[PDB]
Write a protein that binds this ligand. Structure first.
Ligand SMILES: Nc1nc2c(ncn2[C@@H]2O[C@H](COP(=O)(O)OP(=O)(O)O)[C@@H](O)[C@H]2O)c(=O)[nH]1
Ligand SMILES: *CCC(=O)N1CCN(C(=O)CNc2ccc(Br)cc2C)CC1
Length: 156
């Protein structure tokens, strides 16, 4: 009776992909599944489980929506976003794939990527940007819920 969405969290190593997922589900900071209610509608999210790692194309292809995560104190991680977005476009064979740009570790003061640079990038890609902290939970439900909204809009 309930929609199920396969979400992929992608980004450079140590940007907080795992921590974001654990925060979402367990509300704690040290596939995975969670049911959420968004706009009145219950959905089951299935979040599929070194500088950076390249992910299997077949794995990427199973995602219905993607969080593109970088860490706001890691400029190299922000550089990687382009490559992950290009991989998603390639494997999904579409310029229009549900995605959100996520700038993580917003609780840290050592910032090297300005909110405005990321805002401008996300505008160029035509996607929402959300600053998050896996540590404080700031932004976390917003990132995932916004992604589900993107998926639902795309399906309509
Ligand atoms: N301060 C802070 N540290 C974070 C945040 N998210 C992740 N970390 C830390 O960053 C490191 C890498 O996080 P991890 O989830 O393993 O990154 P992944 O490789 O992208 O899955 C760990 O030491 C985490 O505790 C966050 O929002 N704030
Ligand atoms: C900073 C992030 C970055 O430079 N990249 C580029 C490499 N990459 C890929 O995902 C592309 N490589 C890839 C993927 C699947 C298969 Br099958 C084979 C290959 C070579 C990670 C992001």
């Amino acid at each position: 009776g309930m929609t199920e969405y396969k979400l992929v969290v992608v980004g450079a190593v140590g940007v907080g992909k795992s921590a974001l997922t654990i925060q979402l589900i367990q509300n704690h900071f040290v596939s995975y599944r969670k049911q959420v209610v968004i706009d009145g509608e219950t959905s089951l999210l299935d979040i599929l489980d070194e500088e950076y790692s390249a992910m299997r194309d077949q794995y990427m292809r199973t995602g219905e929506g993607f969080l593109l995560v970088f860490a706001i104190n890691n400029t190299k991680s922000f550089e990687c976003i382009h490559h992950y977005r290009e991989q998603i476009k390639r494997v999904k064979d579409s310029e229009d794939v549900p995605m959100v740009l996520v700038g993580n570790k917003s609780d840290l003061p050592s910032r090297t990527v300005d909110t405005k640079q990321a805002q401008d990038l996300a505008r160029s890609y035509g996607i929402p940007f959300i600053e998050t902290s896996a540590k404080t939970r700031q932004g976390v439900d917003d990132a995932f819920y916004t992604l589900v909204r993107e998926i639902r809009k795309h399906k309509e």
